[PDB]
Amino acid sequence: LTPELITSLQELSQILDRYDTIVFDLGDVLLHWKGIDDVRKMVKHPVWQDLEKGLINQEFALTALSCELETPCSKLKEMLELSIASLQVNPLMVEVLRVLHKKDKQIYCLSNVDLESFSYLYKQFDFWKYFDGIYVSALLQLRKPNPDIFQYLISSASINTKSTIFIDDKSENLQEAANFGISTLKYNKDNFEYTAIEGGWPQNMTPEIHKKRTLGEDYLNLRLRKFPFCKSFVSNNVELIGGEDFSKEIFSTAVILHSYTSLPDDIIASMCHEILNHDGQNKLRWCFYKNEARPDNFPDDLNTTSMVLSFLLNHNKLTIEKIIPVAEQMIANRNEEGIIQVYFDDNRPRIDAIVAINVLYLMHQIGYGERKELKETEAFVFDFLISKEYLKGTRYYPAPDVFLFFLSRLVVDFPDQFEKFHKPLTEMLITRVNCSTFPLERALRIIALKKLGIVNRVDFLKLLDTQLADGGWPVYGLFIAPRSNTYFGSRELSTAFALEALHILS
Amino acid sequence: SHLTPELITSLQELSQILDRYDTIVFDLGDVLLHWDSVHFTSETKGIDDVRKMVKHPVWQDLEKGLINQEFALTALSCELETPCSKLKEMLELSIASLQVNPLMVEVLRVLHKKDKQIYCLSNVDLESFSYLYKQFDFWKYFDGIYVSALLQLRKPNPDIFQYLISSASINTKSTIFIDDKSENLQEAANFGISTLKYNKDNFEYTAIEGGWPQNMTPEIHKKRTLGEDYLNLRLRKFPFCKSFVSNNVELIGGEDFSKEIFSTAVILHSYTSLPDDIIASMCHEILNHDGQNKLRWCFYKNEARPDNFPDDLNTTSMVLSFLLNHNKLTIEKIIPVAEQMIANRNEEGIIQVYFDDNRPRIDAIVAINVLYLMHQIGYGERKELKETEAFVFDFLISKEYLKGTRYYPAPDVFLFFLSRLVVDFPDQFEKFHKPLTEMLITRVNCSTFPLERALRIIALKKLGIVNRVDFLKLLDTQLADGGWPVYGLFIAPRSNTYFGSRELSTAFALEALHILS
Ligand SMILES: CC(C)=CCC/C(C)=C/CC/C(C)=C/COP(=O)(O)OP(=O)(O)O
Ligand SMILES: CC(C)=CCC/C(C)=C/CC/C(C)=C\COP(=O)(O)OP(=O)(O)O
Ligand SMILES: CC1=CC[C@H]2C(C)(C)CCC[C@]2(C)[C@H]1COP(=O)(O)O
Ligand SMILES: CC1=CC[C@H]2C(C)(C)CCC[C@]2(C)[C@H]1COP(=O)(O)O
Ligand SMILES: [Ca+2]
Ligand SMILES: [Ca+2]
Ligand SMILES: [Cl-]
Ligand SMILES: [Cl-]
Ligand SMILES: [Cl-]
Ligand SMILES: [Cl-]
Ligand SMILES: [Cl-]
Ligand SMILES: [Cl-]
């Protein structure tokens, strides 16, 4: 066909408004800017593709290019970083972005950025909030102009090829996008090349993925149907190697109900029954143990309580009227720095950032969101993130991704009261993509990032591998009794989170 | 309409049937081995039959090397509701009751005496396979061993059969399969392979005409050609193999050095499929080297030779060994240099690394490469070699190779070079075989560095075992230009300076892909 050179902003505004979904490229669209003096030679080398698909980090790609390009490793690095910093926002396109966002459009970002750079550009600029989904190559292990990434974007976002227009400066990228029935709009610094394209007619793993998802579902269903009081094993390592059956704590049952939403109704009913008949429930405060295992003077905790109450309220098993009293006791549990503490016992003073997150969640869920007493507790969690002190884990949660996950719930479900948490949190999660092997830690990152509007397909892929032949994933130690260093876990907890990660990316 | 198999009972006929076939495939368990499954331990709680552990699906993940026993047990600990420590006892008692089946192991020996083609196809977790290779002694009768843990493939998946036929170039017309599991026999029969079911007091023979006609090969031929092109282009532009230096095996932040001749020799010695023009081009660099005094080589070029840095034996051994094997030097000229090396022993009789009494030092790998030259020139029987050979042997038996050598920190490097010696002079190194081979088995897919993967792929293949796992994951780490990432093969221990090159890594990688094709 033949493009339609556009030079009138009025024409552009009318052309864009004819589409429900707009897809932006990053380079030259939204952002413009010893040996080899041209960085163009690095980006044109085949090894750069391995960097864009996340297969290797910049450090790897640099040393590999030092050899191929016959340039000192230090120089290629200094030039690459200088190129990154010099990136500037394109004011025209950023405004075209904010506009299409206030007009309630579907706006996705499809760029070929390496993970480390994308993590930097996410912290540098602020137009990221205008996107509904972010599809970066380093998090997909795909890259333009391979048709795979386009098919994945279409099926991932449920995009309709018609009413969808793609903006990019590369002809090959637009060329491929058009083969799927997407209208193209090439960005030249002077003008635009508009090419309307008829769309409507309808990835490459739905056959394999649907099978593993079914297998995993069947496994977890059987377990919880046989043990609605979620089982738990105990050891001294996060892998629960040589662990012994315990199954005398109620928190695991909560976590499952609070995280995996696709549970069949009969399991949810049966598991909910356990959360109610729990003999550790005095009033509407819960104890971690059953009475049969309660170690004598072991008090009730705000973590099991915050979850059980938050869940029951969200499922119409309690009224805010019944809960606010309990919530007020928690307000009275503040330590000398104004931080809500973990136990209903002034003689067991202990604080935990994740416990504070689940308490703060209940507060904002019941209307307590703006109580002046939560100030210190909220700042405690914010500093725990900003100071990167979450890498040392919480008192009872040693895995850093656990804190980021539960924080993402509070930040996504109450965005008005936690807007300053968004970008700092998403930066951390991006830098931690594929940084561990335990499937549960992967599922967490997969879920949290998606809720934050970023698709993490790397951890998703390597999650499918760690599934065992009976559908379930390996046991994992989610929380610990610190003084004795005792991990609690179960294959249910792991399979639950893994299944949700699969569902949230379907 | 169902086929009816000949009921064979006379062992006279059993050898009549088997004699008609060129290739025979044995299953390990219940054919060559048997064992007791039930063990009522001091628990009583839960499972009593190990048959239920092998019956569970999680066992498939163990058989395919995806998990180890400790992992598979803590999982079955939950599924079977049996304490972790009890399932471990049961498995150990089961393994300990393992015994040969004398009837079948004799069938194996006879078929090997008649110079048949015999292969072993069995599902065995990696840790158990390492154990069986040490416990029993019929492995010598196999022309090639295909174990699930070494393949990431298990029976009766048709894939594993298709891989066996492809890897071994098996002509299924004259091939028979001995197994007890009826479903493993059915799948083989659908490949044109005649079956023979092993029962108690009864063989079931079923002739299979066959004739009716792997699947990762297209991806493999492409990646092999790409790596070939990358290496030939690099070596043709720099026949003196370049090298980088840094503080880590990763060679991250590596500065160009390319003033050492060892990399050049290692590639000539290790990559067999090098194009001829490069072999000559690189060979010239070795002969016309700066630090070539007499017939003793120096690691550095004279421009980079530190003050009073002497000639070393590791370079001289390899260079001479290569020049001899390529008919570019006569044994008559090398034996005088070999005598200098025998005159280079320390208080304990171990051949030292340097031609310099002021720089005494020893290295098990350098000893290995020296002993290879000795046995290659007729010195194999010399008295003065005893202490040096034992030094290498204790290094292997004491599992001290796991801490690396003075100049080679990667253990797989020690095993690889020792496998050249053990395999190329078998009559002089029989006691090295089973220990060396079992060690390599326990290290399958134990590290991710491409070069280390190739070393295990090559060594295990020369020792008769096909390592497909490392083979697959080797194709992953291949960068988009064909070549593999850099890798630091040896070090300057005083300053902890690693040497390596993308040429080195790619060279071994291509060899490993070549040797399993
Ligand atoms: C759900 C959840 C993580 C709640 C927070 C606290 C809690 C009840 C955790 C579960 C396991 C446990 C008994 C920890 C305290 O051990 P300790 O015996 O070391 O007690 P201390 O350190 O608090 O005294
Ligand atoms: C692979 C090979 C050729 C091994 C034999 C010796 C050798 C020349 C190794 C390469 C690195 C080097 C030049 C010196 C290391 O010894 P140092 O300089 O660290 O001090 P040392 O010589 O006292 O150990
Ligand atoms: C092609 C290119 C060059 C350098 C590259 C870096 C500066 C190294 C990182 C940000 C991303 C980018 C600008 C990228 C754009 O990606 P695309 O917009 O083309 O997908
Ligand atoms: C699958 C299996 C069961 C138990 C197993 C052990 C006793 C644990 C170890 C030796 C090997 C073996 C007999 C093996 C035989 O392999 P197969 O002949 O069945 O393929
Ligand atoms: Ca671009
Ligand atoms: Ca069998
Ligand atoms: Cl009550
Ligand atoms: Cl505390
Ligand atoms: Cl804490
Ligand atoms: Cl025996
Ligand atoms: Cl030494
Ligand atoms: Cl040593």
mmCIF file with all atom_site columns, C-alpha atoms in Angstrom, chain A residues 45-47 49-50 56 59-60 63-64 67-68 70 73 219 223 226-227 233 239-243 468-470 474 491, chain B residues 56-58 60-61 67 70-71 74-75 77-79 81 84 230 234 238 244 250-254 479-481 485 502:
data_model
loop_
_atom_site.group_PDB
_atom_site.id
_atom_site.type_symbol
_atom_site.label_atom_id
_atom_site.label_alt_id
_atom_site.label_comp_id
_atom_site.label_asym_id
_atom_site.label_entity_id
_atom_site.label_seq_id
_atom_site.pdbx_PDB_ins_code
_atom_site.Cartn_x
_atom_site.Cartn_y
_atom_site.Cartn_z
_atom_site.occupancy
_atom_site.B_iso_or_equiv
_atom_site.pdbx_formal_charge
_atom_site.auth_seq_id
_atom_site.auth_comp_id
_atom_site.auth_asym_id
_atom_site.auth_atom_id
_atom_site.pdbx_PDB_model_num
ATOM 1  C CA . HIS A 1 45  ? 26.091 -6.603  16.785 1.00 0.00 ? 45  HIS A CA 1
ATOM 2  C CA . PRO A 1 46  ? 24.229 -9.934  17.055 1.00 0.00 ? 46  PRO A CA 1
ATOM 3  C CA . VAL A 1 47  ? 25.318 -10.347 20.682 1.00 0.00 ? 47  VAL A CA 1
ATOM 4  C CA . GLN A 1 49  ? 20.011 -9.559  20.817 1.00 0.00 ? 49  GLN A CA 1
ATOM 5  C CA . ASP A 1 50  ? 21.008 -11.905 23.644 1.00 0.00 ? 50  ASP A CA 1
ATOM 6  C CA . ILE A 1 56  ? 22.744 -12.077 29.365 1.00 0.00 ? 56  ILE A CA 1
ATOM 7  C CA . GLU A 1 59  ? 28.369 -7.074  31.998 1.00 0.00 ? 59  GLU A CA 1
ATOM 8  C CA . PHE A 1 60  ? 28.285 -10.251 29.899 1.00 0.00 ? 60  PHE A CA 1
ATOM 9  C CA . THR A 1 63  ? 33.024 -8.460  27.765 1.00 0.00 ? 63  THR A CA 1
ATOM 10 C CA . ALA A 1 64  ? 31.771 -10.345 24.705 1.00 0.00 ? 64  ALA A CA 1
ATOM 11 C CA . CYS A 1 67  ? 36.575 -9.190  22.088 1.00 0.00 ? 67  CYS A CA 1
ATOM 12 C CA . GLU A 1 68  ? 34.458 -8.861  18.936 1.00 0.00 ? 68  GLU A CA 1
ATOM 13 C CA . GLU A 1 70  ? 38.450 -5.070  19.762 1.00 0.00 ? 70  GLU A CA 1
ATOM 14 C CA . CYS A 1 73  ? 35.944 -3.431  28.290 1.00 0.00 ? 73  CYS A CA 1
ATOM 15 C CA . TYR A 1 219 ? -3.150 -31.721 42.495 1.00 0.00 ? 219 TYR A CA 1
ATOM 16 C CA . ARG A 1 223 ? -4.649 -31.939 48.731 1.00 0.00 ? 223 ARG A CA 1
ATOM 17 C CA . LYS A 1 226 ? -8.257 -34.032 51.858 1.00 0.00 ? 226 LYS A CA 1
ATOM 18 C CA . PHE A 1 227 ? -6.644 -31.436 54.168 1.00 0.00 ? 227 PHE A CA 1
ATOM 19 C CA . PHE A 1 233 ? 6.091  -29.159 57.338 1.00 0.00 ? 233 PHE A CA 1
ATOM 20 C CA . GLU A 1 239 ? 13.720 -25.924 51.323 1.00 0.00 ? 239 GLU A CA 1
ATOM 21 C CA . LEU A 1 240 ? 12.302 -27.944 54.254 1.00 0.00 ? 240 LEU A CA 1
ATOM 22 C CA . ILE A 1 241 ? 14.812 -30.728 53.627 1.00 0.00 ? 241 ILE A CA 1
ATOM 23 C CA . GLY A 1 242 ? 14.235 -33.546 56.084 1.00 0.00 ? 242 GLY A CA 1
ATOM 24 C CA . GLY A 1 243 ? 11.111 -31.839 57.363 1.00 0.00 ? 243 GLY A CA 1
ATOM 25 C CA . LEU A 1 468 ? 6.810  -31.881 39.378 1.00 0.00 ? 468 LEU A CA 1
ATOM 26 C CA . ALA A 1 469 ? 5.191  -34.775 37.527 1.00 0.00 ? 469 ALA A CA 1
ATOM 27 C CA . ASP A 1 470 ? 2.211  -34.930 39.932 1.00 0.00 ? 470 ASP A CA 1
ATOM 28 C CA . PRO A 1 474 ? 8.221  -28.284 45.657 1.00 0.00 ? 474 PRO A CA 1
ATOM 29 C CA . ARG A 1 491 ? 3.485  -28.010 48.671 1.00 0.00 ? 491 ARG A CA 1
ATOM 30 C CA . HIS B 2 56  ? 4.821  -42.443 42.140 1.00 0.00 ? 56  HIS B CA 1
ATOM 31 C CA . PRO B 2 57  ? 4.990  -39.738 39.441 1.00 0.00 ? 57  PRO B CA 1
ATOM 32 C CA . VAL B 2 58  ? 7.636  -37.708 41.303 1.00 0.00 ? 58  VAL B CA 1
ATOM 33 C CA . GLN B 2 60  ? 9.904  -39.672 36.912 1.00 0.00 ? 60  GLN B CA 1
ATOM 34 C CA . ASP B 2 61  ? 11.413 -36.299 37.820 1.00 0.00 ? 61  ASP B CA 1
ATOM 35 C CA . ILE B 2 67  ? 15.730 -33.565 40.945 1.00 0.00 ? 67  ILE B CA 1
ATOM 36 C CA . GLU B 2 70  ? 16.976 -35.794 48.764 1.00 0.00 ? 70  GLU B CA 1
ATOM 37 C CA . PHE B 2 71  ? 14.578 -33.595 46.777 1.00 0.00 ? 71  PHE B CA 1
ATOM 38 C CA . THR B 2 74  ? 10.976 -34.764 50.857 1.00 0.00 ? 74  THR B CA 1
ATOM 39 C CA . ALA B 2 75  ? 8.258  -34.599 48.182 1.00 0.00 ? 75  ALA B CA 1
ATOM 40 C CA . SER B 2 77  ? 7.529  -37.628 52.295 1.00 0.00 ? 77  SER B CA 1
ATOM 41 C CA . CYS B 2 78  ? 4.429  -35.464 51.843 1.00 0.00 ? 78  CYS B CA 1
ATOM 42 C CA . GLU B 2 79  ? 2.554  -37.479 49.206 1.00 0.00 ? 79  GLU B CA 1
ATOM 43 C CA . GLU B 2 81  ? 2.653  -39.615 54.360 1.00 0.00 ? 81  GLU B CA 1
ATOM 44 C CA . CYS B 2 84  ? 11.539 -38.192 55.490 1.00 0.00 ? 84  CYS B CA 1
ATOM 45 C CA . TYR B 2 230 ? 32.591 -18.060 14.320 1.00 0.00 ? 230 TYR B CA 1
ATOM 46 C CA . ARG B 2 234 ? 38.399 -15.883 14.736 1.00 0.00 ? 234 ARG B CA 1
ATOM 47 C CA . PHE B 2 238 ? 44.294 -14.631 14.990 1.00 0.00 ? 238 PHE B CA 1
ATOM 48 C CA . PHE B 2 244 ? 42.090 -12.128 28.134 1.00 0.00 ? 244 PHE B CA 1
ATOM 49 C CA . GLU B 2 250 ? 33.949 -15.036 34.237 1.00 0.00 ? 250 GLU B CA 1
ATOM 50 C CA . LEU B 2 251 ? 36.696 -12.857 32.712 1.00 0.00 ? 251 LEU B CA 1
ATOM 51 C CA . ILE B 2 252 ? 34.373 -9.906  33.274 1.00 0.00 ? 252 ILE B CA 1
ATOM 52 C CA . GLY B 2 253 ? 36.387 -6.760  32.706 1.00 0.00 ? 253 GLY B CA 1
ATOM 53 C CA . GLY B 2 254 ? 38.975 -8.822  30.867 1.00 0.00 ? 254 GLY B CA 1
ATOM 54 C CA . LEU B 2 479 ? 25.571 -16.401 21.961 1.00 0.00 ? 479 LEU B CA 1
ATOM 55 C CA . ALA B 2 480 ? 23.802 -15.063 18.881 1.00 0.00 ? 480 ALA B CA 1
ATOM 56 C CA . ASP B 2 481 ? 27.007 -14.786 16.814 1.00 0.00 ? 481 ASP B CA 1
ATOM 57 C CA . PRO B 2 485 ? 31.029 -16.806 26.288 1.00 0.00 ? 485 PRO B CA 1
ATOM 58 C CA . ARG B 2 502 ? 35.996 -17.028 23.554 1.00 0.00 ? 502 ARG B CA 1
#
